[PDB]
């Protein structure tokens, strides 16, 4: 009836290794200890903002499913045009 | 927090007032020491805006028109 | 419960006897025992409580009769104090004569 956990993943899965893999692509050489809590605060205010505009388009069509063309349409407004994931 | 408020008034000692301007300007240290009165302290400067001079000529006098 | 279960302690038997002396032929509901039993167990932890601190400030190590007289003078209010400091001494007088 219910997954006993209701945490809905609390900004989790961004484990120390994942943030130490994205940073290394960037060029970072000696990541400091406190960065991990902060980089789970910047991802958070971004995933919400693409999402609030994404739901707003779907409710306009009255459908209940967030298709990828809705995420490509929301991402253009904020400023970054993803090319091709949805087309 | 007290010492950082002594440089701002240009003095090298943490005297009794500099202790109030650091326990009354914080939001998690003014909810613990919120009933205590500090000896020879003072009050934090605040004047409510409505009182500040802004009657704008006051009016009701001989038509200033 | 009765599965080798523990027995609680309540000042409920004593309250009923006092009700009989002040007003005969009157009874108390079990909900009203709950408000009264808590009061008798809250005035115990304020009158005894000021006595512990009074003993420490002075440096003395015993909570004797004088200390439970300064606590009744400070914690209780105006004329429910003069009528209770006087009542207590009368009962201490009698016990000193016989036990």
């Amino acid at each position: 009836k219910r997954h006993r956990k209701v945490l809905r993943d609390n900004i989790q899965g961004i484990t120390k290794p994942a943030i130490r893999r994205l940073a290394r692509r960037g060029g970072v050489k000696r990541i400091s200890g406190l960065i991990y809590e902060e980089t789970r605060g910047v991802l958070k205010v971004f995933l919400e903002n693409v999402i609030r505009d994404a739901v707003t388009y779907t409710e306009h069509a009255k459908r209940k499913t967030v298709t990828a063309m809705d995420v490509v349409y929301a991402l253009k407004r904020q400023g970054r045009t993803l090319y091709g994931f949805g087309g | 927090l007290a010492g950082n408020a002594a440089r701002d008034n240009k003095k090298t000692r943490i005297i009794p007032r500099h202790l109030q301007l650091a326990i009354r300007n914080d939001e998690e240290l003014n909810k613990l020491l919120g009933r205590v009165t500090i000896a020879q302290g003072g009050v934090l400067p605040n004047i409510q805006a409505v009182l500040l001079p802004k009657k704008t000529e006051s009016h009701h006098k001989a038509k200033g028109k | 419960k009765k599965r080798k279960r523990s027995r609680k302690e309540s000042y409920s038997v004593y309250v009923y006897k006092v009700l009989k002396q002040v007003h005969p032929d009157t009874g108390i509901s079990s909900k009203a025992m709950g408000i009264m039993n808590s009061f008798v167990n809250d005035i115990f932890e304020r009158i005894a409580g000021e006595a512990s601190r009074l003993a420490h400030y002075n440096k003395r190590s015993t909570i004797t009769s004088r200390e439970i007289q300064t606590a009744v003078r400070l914690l209780l209010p105006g004329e429910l104090a003069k009528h209770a400091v006087s009542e207590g001494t009368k009962a201490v007088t009698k016990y000193t004569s016989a036990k």
Partner: protein, 100 residues
């Protein structure tokens, strides 16, 4: 007093007199069971509330709320008004000292 209409503000005086003379709780028990359960999720999950715990929370929460309204009313009658409003609740909380 045609049953059709009593002038505005006269039904309420009958309501105040009848309500102040009885002790039954005024918020429904099943909905308040839920508000406590939702607030508890954040502090921990897998918490089981005994029947008495949600009863006490109802008899304290009603009592804080019944009180704020009497103090909000005292503030309203001060300005010459006869109705509570959103601004009056905030003066009562700053003076009592709760908000800080």
């Amino acid at each position: 007093k045609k049953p059709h209409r009593y002038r505005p503000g006269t039904v309420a005086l009958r309501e105040i007199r009848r309500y102040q003379k009885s002790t039954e709780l005024l918020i429904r028990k099943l909905p308040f069971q839920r508000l406590v359960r939702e607030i508890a999720q954040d502090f921990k999950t897998d918490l089981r509330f005994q029947s008495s715990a949600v009863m006490a929370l109802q008899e304290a929460c009603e009592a804080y709320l019944v009180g704020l309204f009497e103090d909000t009313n005292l503030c309203a009658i001060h300005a010459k008004r006869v109705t509570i409003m959103p601004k009056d609740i905030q003066l009562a909380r700053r003076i009592r000292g709760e908000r800080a």
